[PDB]
């Protein structure tokens, strides 16, 4: 029901039906961010696609032009503008966190305790390719929502 | 026994919670598209030059040409202005 995390009662966490249940562990291990052995560039493209597509909604429908005819275009530009600024945050996060030679700071073990290769997302180039996918994905996802809503 | 000097990674619980090393489940030709079209944005040093300058120029263009139909601040005052309190 409520067990110590991985049987260790002195790690600072619990294993509950929310943290680790068969359906929870499946959906979380299927998100592009937990695909530890797949290309980080293609992760970010799916991430940017999903987010830029989501950002078009609130900007257009709540912006200062929400009740005008210039609504869909402005909130979409505001949506892409939010993707541009977020891509700078993702970039400077990598420039500060990861160096050009450091290995992945990702866990090299599994839930059962065997040695695998760490998620290269947590490296300088692996981050540089992830944020590059987010930017390309976020711009096209903004456009895709802008395509379906006002075209 | 959750303590081991030869495996300090398990003693401290350095486990990947939901990381799945399953291979890429994507359209592999779409991958060749995403890997070659989103490629120039994958240098963080150049991307920072791009986002900083591209956004700065784009923000400048949109604000420089913003019509009065959009910005009250560029449309300007329309009413005649009222005097000051002491015939100012």
């Amino acid at each position: 029901v409520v067990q110590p995390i991985n049987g260790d009662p002195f790690i600072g966490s619990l294993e509950t039906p929310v943290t680790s249940s068969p359906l929870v562990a499946w959906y979380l291990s299927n998100l592009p961010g937990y695909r530890t052995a797949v290309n980080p560039l293609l992760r970010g493209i799916e991430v940017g696609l999903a987010h830029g597509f989501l950002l078009v909604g609130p900007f257009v429908k709540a912006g200062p032009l929400r009740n005008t005819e210039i609504a869909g275009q402005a909130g979409s530009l505001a949506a892409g503008g939010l993707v541009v600024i977020l891509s700078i945050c993702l970039t400077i996060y990598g420039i500060s966190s990861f160096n050009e030679g450091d290995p992945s700071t990702a866990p090299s073990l599994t839930l059962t305790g065997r040695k695998k290769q760490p998620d290269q997302l947590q490296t300088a180039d692996g981050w540089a390719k992830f944020t590059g996918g987010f930017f390309f994905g976020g711009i096209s996802g903004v456009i895709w929502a802008f395509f379906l809503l006002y075209v | 026994v959750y303590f081991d000097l030869e495996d300090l990674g398990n003693t401290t619980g350095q486990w990947d919670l939901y990381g799945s090393d399953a291979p890429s489940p994507y359209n592999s030709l779409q991958s060749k598209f995403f890997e070659t079209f989103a490629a120039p944005f994958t240098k963080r040093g150049l991307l920072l030059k791009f986002l900083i300058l591209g956004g700065g120029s784009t923000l400048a263009y949109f604000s420089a040409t913003a019509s009065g139909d959009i910005l009250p601040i560029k449309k300007g005052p329309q009413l005649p202005p009222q005097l000051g309190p002491r015939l100012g």
Partner: peptide
């Protein structure tokens, strides 16, 4: 208006973003 529409977004959006990004990298460097 032809110049305020240029400098107000530059000093209030671009410069602070460029400054905040610059200082974030200097303070985090080792």
């Amino acid at each position: 208006i032809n110049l305020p529409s240029l400098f107000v977004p530059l000093v209030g959006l671009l410069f602070p973003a460029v400054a905040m990004a610059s200082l974030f990298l200097h303070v985090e460097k080792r």
